[PDB]
Structure 1
Amino acid sequence: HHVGTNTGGVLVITDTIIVKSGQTYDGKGIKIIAQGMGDGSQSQNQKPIFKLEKGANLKNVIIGAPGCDGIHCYGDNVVENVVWEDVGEDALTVKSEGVVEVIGGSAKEAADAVFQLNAPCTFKVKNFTATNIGKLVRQNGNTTFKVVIYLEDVTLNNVKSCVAKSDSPVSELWYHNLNVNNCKTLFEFPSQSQIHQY
């Protein structure tokens, strides 16, 4: 394990970091604290820490409290080895269509959702831990577009509401090596047959 060369540094930011199409922001283990961008509460008006335009990637950053509005993904994004020490309003939001993969890393202390899906997408969570959360994945309430969610090698502890929630009959969730402790209910979808193993 080579921890990154920015390990031990803290970057204090005052505006959202924009990562452009085709670019990869590699924090090399930096911890980010955001100023003036939100308090990590359930207020709906906070700014994202990162905006990942379509085709942008992000890796190897710790996001400290306050989590603000987390990471906004505009599709075709890889988010790798990102640690949310204290999720804000939500951890990551899919804002526009495409494939979005969260690989490695962890999240803790999400009062509500970790991952928020606001557009049709393929959303994969791989090699990920989360503790003390409301929901791991929420498709935006009362929407009926299609998402396909994959949970692969995911460990969850202390899930207050459910692992995943959708109000869309056409959406699907597929899981493989999902371990869950102390969770109220696993899946809140119109029908349980929308959930599959692989």
Structure 2
Amino acid sequence: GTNTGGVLVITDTIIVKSGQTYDGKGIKIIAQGMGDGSQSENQKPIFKLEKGANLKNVIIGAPGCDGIHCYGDNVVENVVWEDVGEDALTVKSEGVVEVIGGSAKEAADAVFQLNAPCTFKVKNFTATNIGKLVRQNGNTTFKVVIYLEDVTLNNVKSCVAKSDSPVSELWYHNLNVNNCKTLFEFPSQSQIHQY
């Protein structure tokens, strides 16, 4: 992309409005004053994607802070997290959220955090050195449906995906996992399906 080689240093969350597409054209973003990328829960998101907002073609440098907050009906395309912060992307409100392309590395805990009922799809994605790829918020029992399609994972220190919800489901297709003791931590393994 034509912003490749540039570094945008920001000091507040970038809000992408409903109906908008933020296209970074390959820019690298470094956030300052928004978090250190540790496990502290009080960091700011790099991006807030309002319902029906899209994001594409961004590299998020360290510190990853609180990553991308999605409010539903969002396409997140070609986003690279060089160093995931507290988490990489959080679904904050109901809708369909797509992560297509890109990659993530160095997530101490979760990459994707699902805090509202949603349909969540990860497609054509790589992640390395992570605690979990997907976590439905603990002890919640609303329904999420997760799809992992063409996803390649390496060095997964807890599990691919974890939910405490019996009604939630995970579907996978062309999933490749290296160095994970425990793929799925759901109430029953019958909640996990191939397609």
Q: TM-score, normalised by structure 1?
A: 0.98
User: Helix, strand or coil: the match of 1:185?
Assistant: coil
Question: Percent of counterpart pairs with the same letter?
Answer: 99
Deviations 1:74-109, CA, capped at 9 Å, x for gaps: 000000000000000000000000000000000000
1:22 offset after TM fit, Å? 0.2
Q: TM-score, normalised by structure 2?
A: 1.00
Structure 2: how far apart are the matches of 1:50 and 1:15?
A: 9
Structure 2: how far apart are the matches of 1:69 and 1:184?
A: 27
1:152 offset after TM fit, Å? 0.1
User: Helix, strand or coil: the match of 2:183?
Assistant: strand
Structure 2: how far apart are the matches of 1:92 and 1:184?
A: 24
1:191 offset after TM fit, Å? 0.1
Q: Which residue of 1 aligns with 2:105?
A: 108
1:39 offset after TM fit, Å? 0.1
Structure 1: how far apart are the matches of 2:57 and 2:180?
A: 29
Q: Which residue of 2 aligns with 1:149?
A: 146
Structure 2: how far apart are the matches of 1:44 and 1:72?
A: 13
| Residues paired across the two proteins, number | 195
Structure 1: how far apart are the matches of 2:28 and 2:139?
A: 36
Structure 2: how far apart are the matches of 1:56 and 1:127?
A: 20
Structure 2: how far apart are the matches of 1:116 and 1:26?
A: 23
Structure 2: how far apart are the matches of 1:71 and 1:135?
A: 17
Deviations 1:88-143, CA, capped at 9 Å, x for gaps: 00000000000000000000000000000000000000000000000000000000
Deviations 1:150-171, CA, capped at 9 Å, x for gaps: 0000000000000000000000
Deviations 1:18-67, CA, capped at 9 Å, x for gaps: 00000000000000000000000000000000000000000000000000
1:184 offset after TM fit, Å? 1.9
Structure 2: how far apart are the matches of 1:88 and 1:19?
A: 20
Structure 1: how far apart are the matches of 2:126 and 2:180?
A: 14
Structure 2: how far apart are the matches of 1:27 and 1:92?
A: 17
Structure 1: gaps of 5 or more residues = none
